[PDB]
Design a protein around this ligand. Structure first.
Ligand SMILES: Nc1ncnc2c1ncn2[C@@H]1O[C@H](COP(=O)(O)OP(=O)(O)OC[C@H]2O[C@@H](n3ccnc3)[C@H](O)[C@@H]2O)[C@@H](O)[C@H]1O
Ligand SMILES: Nc1ncnc2c1ncn2[C@@H]1O[C@H](COP(=O)(O)OP(=O)(O)OC[C@H]2O[C@@H](n3ccnc3)[C@H](O)[C@@H]2O)[C@@H](O)[C@H]1O
Lengths: 209, 213
């Protein structure tokens, strides 16, 4: 599958097949509303990018990742509620779309956590995430390369849209980025990375044309 | 071009120039989070459709509209907070997208109210309104005609997007309607009405492309 370059209001967006961990430069990884780091059968799934990052791709150790999040200078505006009775995992919730920068990784609070489904969003929350994320990346990383996977196409359950396709999520990513970037003179330089294992599942012809 | 029919995932959506008040059938009108009805220089503007509705197009009187809202069977999950201290206007807030049906009008809680800016939304709240509104309309008014104006293209200030174009809001309406309707076997039959005075600011051929998402 050949990379495609889209002209979106003067700005180039690239959609390519590959492996997010091989991208040079900033790489976005979806964490949850707690920035959880425990990978097991109850909290973060090793089948997710959040889990694969922790298991196989950290800058150093889990301890150092935990300390980085604990000591990170979050704005007070980014703190949401505190979940005092949570029996396992972290307790501070963060507002959807919040970033935590760690070397060449943009960690972001993407899904909300639920015991049974682990990763849930409503469709309005999915759109809120995207606008908040794109607005932050276009402010802080103007004119810089940022690579992202297709948000929401893993284990996340988007309420009432359980079988939304990867292609439809990619289209939502593209028009929400267009909305965000239209108010910035110099947006981020976005690349969306489709996992090579899923390339023939995604019909890119709608996107390309 | 004054009118186009779009095939959005198997369902016809019409976009046309016209006057919402002449539509036969259900007509959506954007009210605010309180369903306010006072039209003056402080609360609802007569320049808005909310105001033109109240001033010129009610089923009967303002008193009967107020009673209708007061006695309406809202569900518990549609209530937001109560603004005990508000000095003018209604005090019960409703969740964005809440509907109040009144004869052939779908009144909906669209913008949030600010003393100074009067009508405000963030862009996430605008998208949440649209998804919530289309989901409600597609559930309750499946296979029925529903006409809407271009939401947000009047006096509403969408934070950080003060000059977003009517065409871009129309495309957002179409993209979000497609997302909503893709989960319903029989969606509402949507018509979006562009005011005859603004049709030349919208290229309906550009608009056709949004049927693909
Ligand atoms: N190397 C690689 N290169 C490029 N693409 C890759 C890839 N490997 C996989 N893909 C694909 O990328 C897309 C996104 O995958 P993710 O797994 O990020 O799913 P997503 O639904 O966005 O988020 C999951 C949410 O669940 C939370 N959670 C809760 C419990 N455990 C996790 C998380 O904290 C998060 O919030 C999918 O298409 C994956 O195949
Ligand atoms: N006959 C007609 N046929 C068809 N199109 C017509 C039309 N006449 C006007 N148009 C156009 O329709 C679009 C939408 O117009 P609206 O005025 O509804 O603007 P909107 O920004 O969506 O909402 C305003 C929000 O401010 C709140 N508010 C606060 C104080 N006063 C009001 C309200 O409660 C609401 O929440 C614009 O393009 C109008 O030209």
């Amino acid at each position: 599958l050949k990379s495609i370059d889209l002209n979106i209001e003067g700005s180039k967006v690239t959609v390519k097949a590959g492996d997010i961990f091989l991208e040079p430069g900033l790489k976005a990884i979806a964490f949850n509303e707690y920035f959880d780091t425990i990978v097991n059968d109850r909290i973060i799934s090793a089948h997710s990018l959040n889990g694969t990052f922790i298991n196989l791709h950290l800058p150093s150790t889990i301890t150092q990742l935990d300390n980085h999040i604990t000591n990170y200078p979050f704005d007070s505006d980014e703190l949401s509620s505190f979940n005092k009775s949570r029996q396992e995992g972290k307790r501070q919730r963060f507002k959807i779309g919040t970033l935590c920068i760690y070397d060449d990784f943009i960690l972001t609070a993407f899904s909300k956590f639920d015991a049974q489904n682990k990763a849930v969003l409503t469709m309005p929350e999915y759109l809120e995430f995207l606008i908040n994320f794109w607005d932050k990346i276009n402010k802080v990383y103007a004119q810089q390369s940022v690579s992202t996977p297709i948000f929401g196409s893993g284990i996340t359950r988007i309420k009432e849209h359980k079988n939304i396709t990867d292609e439809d999520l990619l289209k939502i990513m593209l028009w929400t980025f267009r909305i965000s970037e239209m108010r910035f003179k110099y947006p981020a330089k976005l690349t969306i990375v489709i996992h090579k294992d899923k390339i023939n599942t995604i019909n890119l012809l709608d996107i390309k044309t």
